[PDB]
Amino acid sequence: DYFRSMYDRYRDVFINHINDYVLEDDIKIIISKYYKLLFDYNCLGGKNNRGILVILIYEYVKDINCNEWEKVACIAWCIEILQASFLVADDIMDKGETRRNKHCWYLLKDVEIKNAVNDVFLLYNAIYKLLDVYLRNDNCYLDLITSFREATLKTIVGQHLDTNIFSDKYSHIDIDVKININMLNFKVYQNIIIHKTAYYSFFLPIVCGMQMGGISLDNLLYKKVENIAILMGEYFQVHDDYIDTFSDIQNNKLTWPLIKAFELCSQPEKEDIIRNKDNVTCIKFINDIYEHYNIRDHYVEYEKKQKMKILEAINQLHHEGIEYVLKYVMDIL
Amino acid sequence: DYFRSMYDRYRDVFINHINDYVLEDDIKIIISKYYKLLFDYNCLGGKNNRGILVILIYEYVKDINCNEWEKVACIAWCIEILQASFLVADDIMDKGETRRNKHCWYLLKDVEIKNAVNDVFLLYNAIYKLLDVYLRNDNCYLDLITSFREATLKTIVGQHLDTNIFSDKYSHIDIDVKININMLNFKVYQNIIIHKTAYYSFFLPIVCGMQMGGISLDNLLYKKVENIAILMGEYFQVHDDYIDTFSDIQNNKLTWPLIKAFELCSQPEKEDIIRNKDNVTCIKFINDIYEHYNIRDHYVEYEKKQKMKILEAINQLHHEGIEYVLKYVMDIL
Ligand SMILES: Cn1c(=O)c2cc(C(=O)NCCCN3CCCCCC3)sc2c2ccccc21
Numbered sequence: 004d005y006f007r008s009m010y011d012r013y014r015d016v017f018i019n020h021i022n023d024y025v026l027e028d029d030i031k032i033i034i035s036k037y038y039k040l041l042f043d044y045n046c047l048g049g050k051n052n053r054g055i056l057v058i059l060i061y062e063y064v065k066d067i068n069c070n071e072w073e074k075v076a077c078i079a080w081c082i083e084i085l086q087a088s089f090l091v092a093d094d095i096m097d098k099g100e101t102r103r104n105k106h107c108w109y110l111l112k113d114v115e116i117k118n119a120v121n122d123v124f125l126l127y128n129a130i131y132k133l134l135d136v137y138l139r140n141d142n143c144y145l146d147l148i149t150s151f152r153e154a155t156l157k158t159i160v161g162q163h164l165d166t167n168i169f170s171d172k173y174s175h176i177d178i179d180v181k182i183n184i185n186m187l188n189f190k191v192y193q194n195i196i197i198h199k200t201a202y203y204s205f206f207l208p209i210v211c212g213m214q215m216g217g218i219s220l221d222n223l224l225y226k227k228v229e230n231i232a233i234l235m236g237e238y239f240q241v242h243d244d245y246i247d248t249f250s251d252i253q254n255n256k257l258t259w260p261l262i263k264a265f266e267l268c269s270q271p272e273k274e275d276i277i278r279n280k281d282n283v284t285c286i287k288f289i290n291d292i293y294e295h296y297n298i299r300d301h302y303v304e305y306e307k308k309q310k311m312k313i314l315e316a317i318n319q320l321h322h323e324g325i326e327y328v329l330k331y332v333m334d335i336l
Numbered sequence: 337d338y339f340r341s342m343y344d345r346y347r348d349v350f351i352n353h354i355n356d357y358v359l360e361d362d363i364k365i366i367i368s369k370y371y372k373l374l375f376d377y378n379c380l381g382g383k384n385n386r387g388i389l390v391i392l393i394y395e396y397v398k399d400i401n402c403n404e405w406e407k408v409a410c411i412a413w414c415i416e417i418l419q420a421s422f423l424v425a426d427d428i429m430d431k432g433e434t435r436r437n438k439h440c441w442y443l444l445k446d447v448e449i450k451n452a453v454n455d456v457f458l459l460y461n462a463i464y465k466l467l468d469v470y471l472r473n474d475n476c477y478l479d480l481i482t483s484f485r486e487a488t489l490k491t492i493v494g495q496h497l498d499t500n501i502f503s504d505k506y507s508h509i510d511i512d513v514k515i516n517i518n519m520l521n522f523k524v525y526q527n528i529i530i531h532k533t534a535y536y537s538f539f540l541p542i543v544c545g546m547q548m549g550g551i552s553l554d555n556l557l558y559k560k561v562e563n564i565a566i567l568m569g570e571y572f573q574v575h576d577d578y579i580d581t582f583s584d585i586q587n588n589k590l591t592w593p594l595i596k597a598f599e600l601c602s603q604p605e606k607e608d609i610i611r612n613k614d615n616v617t618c619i620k621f622i623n624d625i626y627e628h629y630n631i632r633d634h635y636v637e638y639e640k641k642q643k644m645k646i647l648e649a650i651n652q653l654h655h656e657g658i659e660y661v662l663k664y665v666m667d668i669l
C-alpha cells in the first residue's frame with residue numbers, strides 16, 4: 004500500500020501550478036506556505052478510507068505498472084481532498100469545534116470563515132486540477148470527472164437536507180426573504196443519508212476503481228454496486244450517529260436515535276423530546292430519554308440486520324475481487 | 337439578444353436533475369422551491385456583462401442556428417452562475433450587508449452562512465452540470481470546462497490575496513496554528529486584480545466565445561486577448577475601487593486610492609492612514625486624506641491612460657469582430 008508516500012507528489016504539483024502564476028516571489032512563498040498547510044492539515048490525520056477503497060478495488064479488478072499506480076493514487080488522494088473539502092464545509096456549517104481531535108480549519112487565528120470558504124473552493128478545484136493533470140489522456144477521464152460531479156451534487160443536496168429539514172421553511176410547503184414532526188421518519192432519513200454520505204463515501208470510490216480497471220460503463224454491476232453503496236452508506240451513517248450520541252442534538256440534526264426514540268416513546272416523552280438546543284440540560288434530558296428505551300441495543304440489532312443485507316447484496320455481485328474488497332470493508336466496522 | 341429568456345430553460349433543467357433524485361415528493365417540492373429561489377436571487381438583477389460578452393464574441397466570430405444559440409446562452413448563463421457563486425462567497429467573506437441593493441443571500445432569515453456555503457457549492461457544480469448537459473458532444477467541451485477551472489482557480493487565488501495580504505501571516509515570511517506597508521504597491525495590486533478579476537470577468541468569456549466560434553487553441557490571439565483581458569481587468573477593478581471610496585477601508589482591503597494616497601502623502605499622513613477598522617471616525621479620516629490630495633482626479637488620469645493602452649492593444653488584435661466587441665465594452669465604462 005504505497006499510497007501515503009504519493010501524497011506530497013500530488014500536493015506539491017498543485018502548488019507548483021499556483022507557483023507558475025504571474026506573481027512576485029514573496030507572494031509565491033506566502034501562498035505556497037499557506038496552501039501546503041491547508042492540504043497537510045485537512046487532508047491528513049484521517050483513516051483515508053475512500054482512497055484506500057479506490058486503490059484496493061482497482062488492484063483487484065486488475066500485475067500493474069507505474070503509470071497506473073500513479074493515476075490510481077492520484078484518484079485516491081483526489082477523493083481524500085473531496086472528503087477534506089466536505090469536512091471543512093461541514094465544520095463551517097454546523098459550528099463545530101474539533102475535527103480529527105484538532106481545531107477546525109475555520110477556527111484558527113490565521114484562518115477565519117473568510118479564509119475557510121476560499122480554501123474549500125480551492126481544494127474542490129484542486130481535485131479536478133490533479134485529475135486533469137494525471138488522467139486527461141486516459142479513456143475514462145470524462146467518466147471520472149462526471150462521477151465526481153454527481154457525487155458532489157448528491158452530497159451537497161444531502162447536506163442541505165440534513166441542515167434545513169426541521170427549519171421553518173420546510174414546514175407547510177414560499178420563503179420569507181424547531182422540530183418538524185412529520186419530517187422525522189425512516190424514509191426521509193434514508194434520503195438524507197443516501198444523498199449525503201452513500202455516494203461520495205462508497206459509490207464514488209468503487210466506481211472510480213471499476214472504471215480504471217476497465218469495466219465498461221453499461222455493465223450491470225454499476226447498478227448492483229450502487230445499491231450496495233446505498234446500504235453501506237446507510238449502515239455507516241447510522242453507526243456515525245450512534246457514535247455521536249454514544250453534537251447532533253445541539254444543532255437539531257435528524258438522527259437515527261431521535262427517530263427510534265420517537266417511535267418507541269410515549270406521547271408525553273415525544274413532547275419532552277420536542278421541548279429539548281444549545282443547553283446542557285436539554286441535551287442530557289434527550290440522552291436520558293435515549294438511554295431509557297435503550298436505543299443503544301436497537302442500534303446493535305440494526306447493525307446485524309444491515310450487515311446481513313449488505314453481505315447478501317455482495318454475494319449477489321458475482322465478482323470475486325470486488326466482493327472480497329467489500330467484505331473486508333464491512334469487516335472493518 | 338435573446339439571452340434572458342433562455343434563463344429559465346437552463347435553471348429548470350438543473351432543478352429537474354435534482355428532481356430526478358430518489359426523494360419523496362414533499363422534499364422534492366421544498367428543495368425545488370429553495371434552489372429556484374437561490375438561482376433567481378443571486379443570478380438575476382445584475383447587468384450580466386460576462387454572458388453578454390460571450391454571446392457577442394461568439395456571434396461576431398461567426399448566420400447561426402438554434403443549437404449553437406442554445407449552447408452559447410448556456411455558456412453565458414454558466415458564467416453568470418460563476419459570477420453569482422463568487423459574489424455570494426465574497427459576501428460571506430467580507431461580511432457585506434447589501435448586494436445588488438438587496439440583503440445578501442447569507443443574511444436572510446431562511447439562509448444563514450450554513451446554507452450559503454452549501455448553495456455556493458451547488459451553483460459551482462450546476463455550472464459544470466449544465467455545461468455537460470449542453471456541450472459534452474461539442475468538440476470544445478474539455479477546453480471550456482478547463483477554461484472554467486483555470487478562471488476559478490485564479491479568481492480564488494486573487495480573492496485569497498485580496499483578503500489576507502495585510503494579515504499577520506503575510507508579514508515576515510510559518511503559521512500560528514494591521515497594514516503591512518511593504519505589501520501596498522502597484523505590483524502586488526496588479527497581481528491581486530489580475531488573478532482576482534481579470535480572468536473570470538474578461539478572459540474567460542472571450543475565450544469561450546472564440547473557442548465556440550471555431551478558433552483553434554494554439555492561435556496567437558489567445559495570448560493577445562489574455563493581455564487585453566488583464567488590462568481591462570485592471571481598468572475596471574480600479575474603477576470598482578473608485579466607486580467604493582467615491583467598505584474597503586472597513587475590511588482593510590488594499591485599494592488603488594490607498595496606494596496612491598500613500599505615494600502622494602507625507603510621512604505623518606502615512607502614519608495617520610496606518611492608524612485608521614470598523615469605526616466611522618477612522619473611515620472619514622481616510623476619506624479626508626483621499627480628498628486632500630484629490631486622488632479622485634488621479635483616477636481620471638489613470639482611466640484615460642489605461643483606456644488608451646487597452647485600445648492600443650485592441651487595435652493590435654487584428655480581428656474585426658473581437659475588436660469591435662471590445663471597443664464597445666470599453667465604451668460602456
Ligand atoms: C470506505 N469507508 C467509508 O467510505 C466510510 C464513511 C464513513 C462515515 O461515517 N461518513 C459520514 C460523514 C458525513 N459527511 C457527509 C458529507 C458532507 C459533510 C460532512 C459529513 S465511515 C467509512 C468507513 C469505515 C471503515 C472502513 C471503511 C470506510
Ligand SMILES: Cn1c(=O)c2cc(C(=O)NCCCN3CCCCCC3)sc2c2ccccc21
Pocket residue numbers: 385386389422423425426491495532533537538572573576665668669
Ligand atoms: C464585461 N464586463 C466585465 O467583465 C466587468 C467586470 C467588472 C468588475 O468591476 N469586477 C470586480 C468584482 C470583483 N469580484 C472578484 C471575484 C471574487 C469575489 C467577488 C468580487 S465591471 C465589468 C463591465 C462593465 C461594463 C461593461 C462590461 C463589463
